[PDB]
Swiss-Prot record, chain B:
Positions carrying Phosphoserine: S26, S60
GO cellular component terms, semicolon-separated: cerebellar granule cell to Purkinje cell synapse; cytoplasm; cytosol; glutamatergic synapse; intercalated disc; mitochondrion; plasma membrane; presynapse
Residues the record lists as N-acetylglycine modifications: G3
Subunit structure: Homodimer. Interacts with many nuclear hormone receptors and cofactors including AR, ESR1, ESR2, MC2R, NR3C1, NRIP1, PPARBP and THRA. Interacts with ABL1 (phosphorylated form); the interaction retains it in the cytoplasm. Weakly interacts with CDKN1B. Interacts with ARHGEF28 and CDK16. Interacts with KCNK18 in a phosphorylation-dependent manner. Interacts with SAMSN1. Interacts with the 'Ser-241' phosphorylated form of PDPK1. Interacts with the 'Thr-369' phosphorylated form of DAPK2. Interacts with PI4KB, TBC1D22A and TBC1D22B. Interacts with SLITRK1. Interacts with MEFV.
Post-translational note: Phosphorylated on Ser-60 by protein kinase C delta type catalytic subunit in a sphingosine-dependent fashion.
Organism: Mus musculus (Mouse)
Main location per the UniProt record: cytoplasm
Coiled-coil zones: none
Protein name: 14-3-3 protein eta
From Swiss-Prot, chain F:
Modified residues (Phosphoserine): S3, S17
Expression sites by tissue: Expressed in subventricular zone (SVZ) neuroprogenitors and ependymal cells.
Annotated compartments: Cell membrane; Endosome membrane
Name of the protein this chain belongs to: Protein numb homolog
Residues shown, of full length: 274 to 297 of 653
Lineage, uppermost ranks: Eukaryota, Metazoa, Chordata, Craniata, Vertebrata
Physiological role: Regulates clathrin-mediated receptor endocytosis. Plays a role in the process of neurogenesis. Required throughout embryonic neurogenesis to maintain neural progenitor cells, also called radial glial cells (RGCs), by allowing their daughter cells to choose progenitor over neuronal cell fate. Not required for the proliferation of neural progenitor cells before the onset of neurogenesis. Also involved postnatally in the subventricular zone (SVZ) neurogenesis by regulating SVZ neuroblasts survival and ependymal wall integrity. May also mediate local repair of brain ventricular wall damage.
Subunit structure: Interacts with SIAH1. Interacts with LNX. Interacts with CDH1. Interacts with TFAP2A and TFAP2B. Interacts with RALBP1 in a complex also containing EPN1 and TFAP2A during interphase and mitosis. Interacts with AAK1. May interact with DUOXA1.
Organism: Mus musculus
Knockout-associated phenotype: Mutant animals exhibit severe defects in cranial neuronal tube closure and die around 11.5 dpc, but neurogenesis abnormalities are limited. Mice lacking both Numb and Numbl genes die around 9.5 dpc, with severe defects in somite and vasculature formation, neuronal tube closure and axial turning. Conditional mutants, with expression abrogated in neural progenitor cells from 8.5 dpc are viable, fertile and exhibit no obvious phenotypes.
Posttranslational mods: Phosphorylated on Ser-3 and Ser-17 by CaMK1. Ubiquitinated; mediated by SIAH1 and leading to its subsequent proteasomal degradation Isoform 1 and isoform 2 are ubiquitinated by LNX leading to their subsequent proteasomal degradation.
Length: 22, 225, 236, 237, 227, 19
C-alpha cells in the first residue's frame, strides 16, 4: 500500500447534484 | 432458497457489493418481471441499480455533448456527434426499460391502499421521463416532458393526501419535481415556489432522515435565487 | 481525418466519458493495425486496460471475500451462488488479461527493434503486470505458470531498463515498483521485494536534483510510492 | 364517439386478432373492474382471453413437469434443481392467472348477478369450477383438496341452476356437463361418476336436438361429440 | 453449475415449453458472457429470436391490415394505430437486441477462419435489419434497408469464396437475400436473378443431399411464384 | 385433454424466407 495506480476526476466529488441522492 | 426469485435477489445484492450496477439492474429487472410485489428492500435494490446505470450514461452524455459544443473539422465533429448519440441510445434503452417495468408491473400491481408504493413508483416514472427529456429534442421532447410532469403531478397529489409534509418520500418527490421545473421547464419561479412550500410545510410539522432532504430543498432555493 | 486517428479520437472521447471498455476496444483496434504506438498511444492503451481490469479486480476481491465468509459459515446453498458470481467475474478478468497479452505478443513486443528500449521495457513491464493480475486469482499449478511468466517478463524488462534508462525515468521507476509488489504480494518474498524497491529509490534520489520541474514531479510521485511500500512491508 | 368501455373492448378484439392474449386478458380484466355487467359477447371475450393465457401456462407446465419426473427418476440431482425452479416459475404464473380470474368472479361477475340472471350465473359458476380445476391440476396434498372442493362446489351449483333453467341442448349447459365430467375423471379419478354425468347430458340433449335451427344445432352437436369421445376413451382406458 | 450452464439449461427447457421469450432472454444472457457459441448454442439463439420476432411480425401484419381497412372513425382508427405502434416498438426492441448481440459479441469475436460462423451471423444481421425495414418508413427505413443489404452482401461474398454452392447456409442466405430484393427493394428481376443463379450453381454440383435440396426447393418455389 | 376447447388457416400460409 501498492502498485503504480489522477485526472480532473479529482474535482468530481465536489459536484453539486440538484436532485435526490441514495 | 433455490427458486428464481431468491437466485436473482442474491445476484443483485452481490452485484451491489461489487459495484457492478448493470448486473444489479439486469437482476432486479428479472425479479420485477416475475410479477410479484417488491418489498421496500427489493424496491430500494431496483432503484439503486437503475439510478447508478442511468447516472453513468447521463454523466458520460454530458461530457461528450459538452465536447460537441466545441465545434469549430466536419469529420471530427461528426464522430463526436455519433459517439454522443451512441451513449444517448444506451441511456434511452435504460430509461425505457425502467418505464416499462413501472408501467407493466410496479405501478399496475399497487393496491389502492399502498400509497407509499404508488408515490415512490410514480416519482420514479417522473424521474426517468425527466432523464429522457434531458436529451430529447423536438416533438419527442415535448412528449416526455409532458409524461414526466403528469407522473410527478399524480404522485404529488397522492402524497399531499396521504403523507405528512415531513415524510422523506414526499419531500424527495417535491425536491425532484422542483428540479423538473427548474432544469426541464426553465420555470425558476414555479420551481422555487414548489421547493418553498414543501420546506415550509415540513418545517411547520417538525427520523432525522427528513432533515437531510429539507436541506437539499433549501440549498436549491438558495442557489436558484 | 484518417482511420487510425479516428480510432484514437474514439479512445480519448471514451476516456473523457469514463467509458473504458469503449476506450480499450478502440486501443485494441489501433494495435491490431500493426503499426507502432507512440508514447501517447501506449499511455492510452495502458490507461484503458488498467481501468477495465481494475474494475474486475476490485469486484473479484469483494465477491471472493464474501465467498470465503460464506464457506466458513457453511451456508452451502449460498456458497454455490457466490462462487458462480466470483467465477463469472474471474472469467471476465482472465479474458481482459489474455486480450492484453495477445496484443503484446502478436504486435507490440513482436514489432519492437532492439534499439527501442523504452517501448520494450514498457511492453515487457505490462506483460509482467497482466500475468501478475492472472496470478492474483489463480491457485495451484495454474498460478505457478502465470507467476513464472510474470517474473520472466519483469526480469527482462528490468535488465533492459537498468542498461538503457536513467534511475529517474518514470517507466523504470514504475517497473521497479510493480516488480517489488510482485515479490511481496505474489511471491510472499518480502526481503527480495524490499531489496528491489530500496535499490530503485536510492538509485533515483541521488540523481533527482538534475531534473526539470515536470520530470521531477513524475519521478517523485513514483518514488513516494516505493517509500510507502517499504515502510508498510518492513512493519508487516 | 367511442366511450372508455368500448375502447377496452376494441383493445381486446384487436388483441384477439393479433393472438396477443395477455393483452386481451388485461383489457377484459379492466372491463370487468368497471363494475358493469358483461354482455353475452363480453363474457365470451373474457373467457377466450383467459382460456388462452392459462392454457399456454398449463401446456408449458405439463411439459416441464414431465421433464422433472424423468430427471428425478434418473437421480440427476443438480439438473433436477434447475428443472424444478422452472416448473415452479411456470406454476406461479399459472396460479396468478387463476387467482386473477377467480377474484374477478368473486368480486364482480358472480357478485353482481341477480337471481333471474340464470345464464350469467351458470357461465360464471362454471368458469369458477374450471379455474379451481386448473389449480387442482398443479396442486397436491391439502392444498389440492382445498381447490378440488371449491371446484366441485362451483360446478355443482352451476349444474343445479342449469338443469332447472336451461334446455339440455343449450351449449353452456352442455359445456358445463362436459367440464364437470372431466373434473370427476381427471381430478377425482372417479370414472363411473364421470361417465354417468357425461352420458346423462348426451342423452338429455340428443332427444331435443331435432328442434334446433341450423346454427344452434352446430353449437350443441360440437359439444355433444366431445361428450361422446370422452365416454368412449374413459370406458376403454 | 456456473451461469453459462444454468442459462443454457433454462433455454432448452424454455424451448421445450414453447416459451420463446424465456428462451431468448436466456440465450441473450449466454451471448453476453462474451464466449463463443457452439453450433448447438448458435441454433438455440437463432430459434429463440426467430420465434419471438415472428410473433411480433405476425401480430404487426394483422393490426396494420386492420388499420388499412379502418380508413372508412377517427377515434377508432387512432386506437388501432396506437396498438400497431405498441407492437411495432416491441418488434424494434427485439430486432435491436439481436443486432446489438451480433455487433457487440457474435460477429466481433469471429476468428478469420470461422467462415461458417461469419456467414451465419452476418446473414442474421441482414435478416433483423430486414425485419426493421418491414415496418420502418421515411429516413429510418433508408438506413435499415442499406444496413440489411450491406450485411447480406458481405455474408454472400464470404460464402462465395469459402462455401460450396450446395452448402445449406449459403443457400439459405441466397434465399433470404433474394427475399430482401423482392419484398424490401421491390426489385423482382434482381431477386429472381439471385435466386436463379444460386439454385443453378447448386444443382450444377448436386444424406447431405436432403439438406441442400430442401432449401433449393424453396428457391424454386419463390422463382415459380415470382415469375 | 378432454374439456371444452378461422385464423387456423395459418398452417396454409407460405413463408418466403428460410424456416
Amino acid at each position: 500500500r501498492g502498485s503504480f495506480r489522477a485526472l480532473s476526476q479529482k474535482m468530481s466529488p465536489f459536484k453539486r447534484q440538484l436532485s435526490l441522492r441514495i | 432458497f433455490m427458486g428464481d426469485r431468491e437466485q436473482l435477489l442474491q445476484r443483485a445484492r452481490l452485484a451491489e457489493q461489487a459495484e457492478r450496477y448493470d448486473d444489479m439492474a439486469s437482476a432486479m429487472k428479472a425479479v420485477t418481471e416475475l410479477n410479484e410485489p417488491l418489498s421496500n428492500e427489493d424496491r430500494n435494490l431496483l432503484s439503486v441499480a437503475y439510478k447508478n446505470v442511468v447516472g453513468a450514461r447521463r454523466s458520460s452524455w454530458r461530457v461528450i455533448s459538452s465536447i460537441e459544443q466545441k465545434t469549430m473539422n466536419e469529420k471530427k465533429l461528426e464522430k463526436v456527434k455519433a459517439y454522443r448519440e451512441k451513449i444517448e441510445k444506451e441511456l434511452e434503452t435504460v430509461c425505457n426499460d425502467v418505464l416499462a417495468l413501472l408501467d407493466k408491473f410496479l405501478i399496475k400491481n399497487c393496491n389502492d391502499f399502498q400509497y407509499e408504493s404508488k408515490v415512490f413508483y410514480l416519482k420514479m416514472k417522473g424521474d426517468y421521463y425527466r432523464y429522457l427529456a434531458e436529451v430529447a429534442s423536438g416533438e419527442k421532447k415535448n412528449s416526455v416532458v409532458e409524461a414526466s410532469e403528469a407522473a410527478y403531478k399524480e404522485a404529488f397529489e397522492i402524497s399531499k393526501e396521504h403523507m405528512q409534509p415531513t415524510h422523506p418520500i414526499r419531500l424527495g418527490l417535491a425536491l425532484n419535481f422542483s428540479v423538473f421545473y427548474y432544469e426541464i421547464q426553465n420555470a425558476p419561479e414555479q420551481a422555487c415556489l414548489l421547493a418553498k412550500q414543501a420546506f415550509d410545510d415540513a418545517i411547520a410539522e417538525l427520523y432525522k432522515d427528513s432533515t437531510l432532504i429539507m436541506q437539499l430543498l433549501r440549498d436549491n432555493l438558495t442557489l436558484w435565487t
